[PDB]
Amino acid sequence: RRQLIRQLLERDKTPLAILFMAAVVGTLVGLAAVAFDKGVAWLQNQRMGALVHTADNYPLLLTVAFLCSAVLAMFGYFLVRKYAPEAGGSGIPEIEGALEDQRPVRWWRVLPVKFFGGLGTLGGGMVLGRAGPTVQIGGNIGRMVLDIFRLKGDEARHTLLATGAAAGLAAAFNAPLAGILFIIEEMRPQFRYTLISIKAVFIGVIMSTIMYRIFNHEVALIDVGKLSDAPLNTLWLYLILGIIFGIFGPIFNKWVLGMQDLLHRVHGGNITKWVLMGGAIGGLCGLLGFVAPATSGGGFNLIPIATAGNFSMGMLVFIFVARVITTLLCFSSGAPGGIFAPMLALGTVLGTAFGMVAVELFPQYHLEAGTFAIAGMGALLAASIRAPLTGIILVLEMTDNYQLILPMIITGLGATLLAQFTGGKPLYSAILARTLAKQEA
Amino acid sequence: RRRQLIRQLLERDKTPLAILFMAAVVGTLVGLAAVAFDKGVAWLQNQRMGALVHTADNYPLLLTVAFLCSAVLAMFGYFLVRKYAPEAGGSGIPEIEGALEDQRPVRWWRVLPVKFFGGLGTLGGGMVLGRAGPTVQIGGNIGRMVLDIFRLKGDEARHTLLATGAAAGLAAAFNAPLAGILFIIEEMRPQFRYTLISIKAVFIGVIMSTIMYRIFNHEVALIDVGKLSDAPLNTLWLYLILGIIFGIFGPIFNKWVLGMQDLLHRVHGGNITKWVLMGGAIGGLCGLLGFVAPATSGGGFNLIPIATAGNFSMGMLVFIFVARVITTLLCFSSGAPGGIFAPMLALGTVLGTAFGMVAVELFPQYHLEAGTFAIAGMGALLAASIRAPLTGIILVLEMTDNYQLILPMIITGLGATLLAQFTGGKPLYSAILARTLAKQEAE
């Protein structure tokens, strides 16, 4: 107790040095994150202008689509396998690991690999997100300044690694809060005390978000408008939807885990069968990117279209299954780049579908499907990644429909609740586990 | 410890269904409780106005029943606290914070009636005090009481239902779900060691609470501020400045509240009757101020939209800030039942507004609205005096829906905590918990 009294009186006194260096990490991650994003766009762009150069010979343009992305794919699968293997998949598990002191931050290897590796997979139009990549990049960015400036101490190593990861999700979504909240909900050591200064992570998130804004202002990644409010007599439908995400989450989770296994057979561990296989996936993604663009790429493009109910019911069901397919294929392949963001599209689509049904079952509720799209947008995040506070807050920061907070929070819990009750797990904790298991075996 | 972690990682987020269900119960009661507390406080402030109209001609008589009404209810509240539950004086947040450290008892049989009826006295009197503390402590004990009744066992359950209590507690106070949840996991939970507090469960509690408040309070916001103008990048540096301003003020304010506790203690020395009398004097001053200068008394939620909208002269903004600082200290440092959290929103708004004023005239190249600076400054005393910036930013966001100001709100907030740290200041709740924990041994 007299310990506590002495501790209370000492609370929130983050070492100025830790604070100042947070500012620099955030800034470096911001620029980096910005740089990564523009990079991706540019290459998605060239692949479009090359389909223009050959826009008459249909079997040929199908080819240059495939190849342009297939090649770009390969450069990434290669860049990871050869120089930094810890930069396959998301990279959140990896940095999550790092915060436990159970995996290594080889920044001199991963910064170039993840950044350029990510440039190829994403820029090739593969179904993966910049989040994991930017969270990882940001962690290593923060690690690198720790090293360079030779900051000593557990607190400095934990905090600077943390602000980098928050700054990087911030910068990838224009979600300063979601960034901060991710580190406190999910990313930090879940099972024991740690000295991570919240105020220092904040300071990093700002500089990160600010960089993003210098280069990306007057446009937002998702615009959805202002949707209707949600009647209290309407809320129970949001508990049902959360239950549907809650049973699905774990199933989807298994599938990403198992497809990891099954795709690993195709190459056995071999860098050449891998990159070859990788390029076939990546070439299929640049192919899909032309014949049916909603089945491929990041998926952000169809969130707004879906929310405004501008899809038929079939089109929705198509998009949902077509994207369950190409999400597992892309992420369980090993390719650098996350599953977080492509879940946003997955959830939005599922929700909208559920919205469509409500609208005709209950004309008395004066429903808009787009409200269920918004409740569902971070619902997969809640059921599979099991960070619903960060999901909810992210979607909020991304869609500005704050009057939907009750529906979103209800579907949120409805997902985490039923995900737990059907014995699913935190996917990023299942993956870090899967990786510490092969490490001591 | 690699092997332990692989085990732990795979067992993560598996909250006992008992705790989950009980969180829902705690939620629901905390909600009804807070709704009641709010409807109660309103009804009294009201009859008190019905009183003044009953005598709207004889000004000296009207200035009198203004005083006595608030004086009587003040006393009744001070009295309930000294006599039956002394740990229901002040905010209630340091206490429930203490409870999470297992260093202060949750005497729910005593505090539930004392805080609820004593707060109803002081708030209903029109004293300058928050509902936040009160409903946070009320909710904590509601939490404890369902723990006792259902005889749940295990640390998880205790801390959890305690945490869920205070979180659903704050959420119902403000219609602010995210802000409640966040307050638990930023400021409320134990700061220097690990704990097992299901976030999932606090979430379930918070939902139920917020839903209950929505049953009885739909369609009318605590604060309507409408949509304001955006902030240009080249304007952000002006928020960092305002942050710094709060950051030096934060700790200064803190000292006054603590010192004023000491100064006010000498007026009674501990004596229940001197104390109660002093409360009735204070209370009456407030109910008088409520008639003659309403912006200097009461909770302040009213003058928030006005300030943001630019309808106050700088003269008024200065008058309000000084006089409200003054009566905020008088009321909270006196140890009546009731918080300092909510009236720190008003103090901030005004201060922010004031800065927006001077900002607007100094920089017409910016096309400023003084109201963006008010909204920046709302969560700012929360950041500089309480050092819970992430809660204040999110709280205000929930309360004002101006998301396009997230960057300046954040920036002003960090500014506040940074300068509050640097200028040698401490979190107000923690420094009150410690003051009380230290006095526990001193004698």
- Three-class DSSP labels, chain A: CHHHHHHHCCCCCCCHHHHHHHHHHHHHHHHHHHHHHHHHHHHHHHHHHHHHHCCCCHHHHHHHHHHHHHHHHHHHHHHHHHHCHHHCECCHHHHHHHHHCCCCCCHHHHHHHHHHHHHHHHHCCCCCECHHHHHHHHHHHHHHHHHHCCCCCHHHHHHHHHHHHHHHHHHHHCCHHHHHHHHHHHHCCCCCCCCCCHHHHHHHHHHHHHHHHHHHCCCCCCCCCCCCCCCHHHCHHHHHHHHHHHHHHHHHHHHHHHHHHHHHHHHCCCHHHHHHHHHHHHHHHHHHHHHCHHHCCCCCCHHHHHHCCCCCHHHHHHHHHHHHHHHHHHHCCCCECECHHHHHHHHHHHHHHHHHHHHHHCHHHCCCHHHHHHHHCCHHHHHHHCCHHHHHHHHHHHHCCHHHHHHHHHHHHHHHHHHHHCCCCCHHHHHHHHHHHCCCC
Q: How far apart are the first and last CA of chain B?
A: 44
The number of residues making up chain B comes to: 443
User: Which residues on adjacent β-strands are paired with residue A336?
Assistant: A89
* Cα A99 to Cα B191: distance, rounded to the nearest angstrom: 19
- Phi, psi torsion values for A282, nearest 5 degrees: -55, -30
* Cα A392 to Cα A399: distance, rounded to the nearest angstrom: 10
Instruction: Please judge whether B200 and A413 are an interchain contact, meaning their C-beta atoms are less than 8 angstroms apart.
Output: yes
Out of A177, A192, A425, the one facing B12 most closely (by C-beta) is A425
Instruction: Please judge whether B14 and A420 are an interchain contact, meaning their C-beta atoms are less than 8 angstroms apart.
Output: yes
Looking up tokens 């997979």 gives A121
Nearest to B89 by CA among B342, B333, B337: B337
Query: In the structure encoding, which two tokens stand for residue B317, read together?
Result: 């903004």
Query: Do the annotations mark residue B366 as ligand-binding?
Result: no
Report yes or no: A133 and A91 within 8 Å, Cβ to Cβ: yes
Looking up tokens 């079939």 gives A314
Query: Do the annotations mark residue B340 as ligand-binding?
Result: yes
Q: Judge residue A423's burial from the number of C-beta atoms within 10 Å of its C-beta, 0-12 exposed, 13-18 middle, 19 or more buried.
A: exposed
* Cα A73 to Cα A283: distance, rounded to the nearest angstrom: 7
**Nearest 10 degrees: Cα torsion B135, B141, B142, B143:** 110
Angle of helix B93-100 relative to helix B155-174, nearest 10 degrees, comes to: 160
Instruction: Please judge whether A232 and B210 are an interchain contact, meaning their C-beta atoms are less than 8 angstroms apart.
Output: no
Out of B9, B390, B431, the one facing A432 most closely (by C-beta) is B9
Query: In the structure encoding, which two tokens stand for residue B332, read together?
Result: 């909270």
What does the buried/exposed string (b/e) look like for A329-358 if buried means 16 or more CB atoms within 10 Å of the residue's CB? Answer: bbbbbbbbbbbbbbbbbbbbbbbbbbbbeb
CB-based contacts of B69, cutoff 8 Å, min separation 6? B48, B51, B125, B287
Compute and round to an integer the Cα radius of gyration of chain A. Answer: 21
Q: Choose from B7, B8, B9 for mutation: most chain A CBs within 10 A.
A: B9
Q: Please state whether B387 falls in left (phi above 0), alpha (psi between -120 and 50) or beta.
A: left
* Cα A131 to Cα A126: distance, rounded to the nearest angstrom: 14
CB-based contacts of B311, cutoff 8 Å, min separation 6? none
CB-based contacts of A171, cutoff 8 Å, min separation 6? A29, A30, A32, A33, A34, A134, A138, A179, A208, A209, A211, A212
* Cα B383 to Cα B428: distance, rounded to the nearest angstrom: 10
* Cα B3 to Cα A433: distance, rounded to the nearest angstrom: 10
Q: Compute the nearest-CA separation of B312 from chain A (Å).
A: 29
Contacts of B397 in chain A (CB under 8 A): 402
Domain with residue B258: its CATH number is 1.10.3080.10
Report yes or no: A116 and A73 within 8 Å, Cβ to Cβ: no
Nearest to B349 by CA among B235, B256, B230, B228: B228
Q: Which residue of B has its CA nearest to A422?
A: B14
Contacts of A406 in chain B (CB under 8 A): 177, 207, 210-211, 214
Q: Choose from B5, B182, B199, B395 for mutation: most chain A CBs within 10 A.
A: B5
Looking up tokens 């304001």 gives B228
Instruction: Please judge whether A199 and B434 are an interchain contact, meaning their C-beta atoms are less than 8 angstroms apart.
Output: no
Query: In the structure encoding, which two tokens stand for residue B239, read together?
Result: 């928020």
Looking up tokens 């129970």 gives A236
* Cα A164 to Cα A171: distance, rounded to the nearest angstrom: 10
Give Cα B270 distance to the centre of its chain. Answer: 26
Q: Please state whether B401 falls in left (phi above 0), alpha (psi between -120 and 50) or beta.
A: left
Compute and round to an integer the Cα radius of gyration of chain B. Answer: 22
Q: Compute the nearest-CA separation of A57 from chain B (Å).
A: 47
Report yes or no: A434 and A426 within 8 Å, Cβ to Cβ: no
* Cα A373 to Cα A371: distance, rounded to the nearest angstrom: 5
* Cα A86 to Cα A103: distance, rounded to the nearest angstrom: 9
* Cα A204 to Cα B376: distance, rounded to the nearest angstrom: 19
Q: Which residue of A has its CA nearest to B400?
A: A402
Query: In the structure encoding, which two tokens stand for residue B99, read together?
Result: 């409870």
Out of A1, A397, A420, the one facing B13 most closely (by C-beta) is A420
* Cα A192 to Cα B210: distance, rounded to the nearest angstrom: 31
User: Which residues on adjacent β-strands are paired with residue B337?
Assistant: B90
Q: Compute the nearest-CA separation of B397 from chain A (Å).
A: 9
CB-based contacts of A339, cutoff 8 Å, min separation 6? A89, A90, A128, A129, A132, A256, A327, A331, A427
Looking up tokens 């079952």 gives A361
Out of A13, A386, A393, the one facing B421 most closely (by C-beta) is A13
Domain count, chain A: 1
Out of A180, A192, A433, the one facing B390 most closely (by C-beta) is A180
- Phi, psi torsion values for A259, nearest 5 degrees: -65, -25
Contacts of B434 in chain A (CB under 8 A): 4-5, 8-9
Looking up tokens 């650098």 gives A336
* Cα A125 to Cα A279: distance, rounded to the nearest angstrom: 12
* Cα B396 to Cα A276: distance, rounded to the nearest angstrom: 52
Collapsing DSSP to helix, strand or coil, B339 comes out as strand
CB-based contacts of B76, cutoff 8 Å, min separation 6? B117, B118, B121
Q: Compute the nearest-CA separation of B309 from chain A (Å).
A: 21
CA distances from B246 to A199, A279, B149, B373 (A): 16, 56, 45, 12
Collapsing DSSP to helix, strand or coil, B130 comes out as strand
* Cα B1 to Cα A271: distance, rounded to the nearest angstrom: 32
Out of B15, B203, B210, the one facing A406 most closely (by C-beta) is B210
Contacts of A177 in chain B (CB under 8 A): 393-394, 406
Query: Does an H or E element contain B358, and which?
Result: helix B343-362
Sign, CA dihedral A288-A292-A295-A296, equals positive
Instruction: Please judge whether B13 and A416 are an interchain contact, meaning their C-beta atoms are less than 8 angstroms apart.
Output: yes
Looking up tokens 């999910």 gives A186
Contacts of B203 in chain A (CB under 8 A): 388-389, 409, 412-413, 416
Nearest to B161 by CA among B36, B16, B34: B16
Instruction: Please judge whether A402 and B407 are an interchain contact, meaning their C-beta atoms are less than 8 angstroms apart.
Output: no
- Phi, psi torsion values for B339, nearest 5 degrees: -80, 180
For residue A300, the enclosing domain spans 1-441
Nearest to A96 by CA among B200, B12, B201, B184: B12
* Cα A299 to Cα A127: distance, rounded to the nearest angstrom: 8
Instruction: Give the residue numbers of the binding site of A for chloride.
Output: 90, 339-340, 428
Query: Do the annotations mark residue B194 as ligand-binding?
Result: no
Report yes or no: A384 and A347 within 8 Å, Cβ to Cβ: no
* Cα A343 to Cα A256: distance, rounded to the nearest angstrom: 12
Report yes or no: B327 and B296 within 8 Å, Cβ to Cβ: yes
CA distances from B98 to B59, B106, B115, B140, B312 (A): 47, 9, 17, 11, 40
CB-based contacts of A340, cutoff 8 Å, min separation 6? A90, A92, A129, A131, A132, A381, A385
What does the buried/exposed string (b/e) look like for B107-142 if buried means 16 or more CB atoms within 10 Å of the residue's CB? Answer: bbebbbebbbbbbbbbbbbbbbbbbbbbbbbbbbbb
Out of A1, A19, A176, the one facing B406 most closely (by C-beta) is A176
CB-based contacts of A206, cutoff 8 Å, min separation 6? A26, A176, B407, B410, B411, B414
Sign, CA dihedral B203-B209-B215-B221, equals negative
CA atoms within 13 A on the CB side of B190: 22
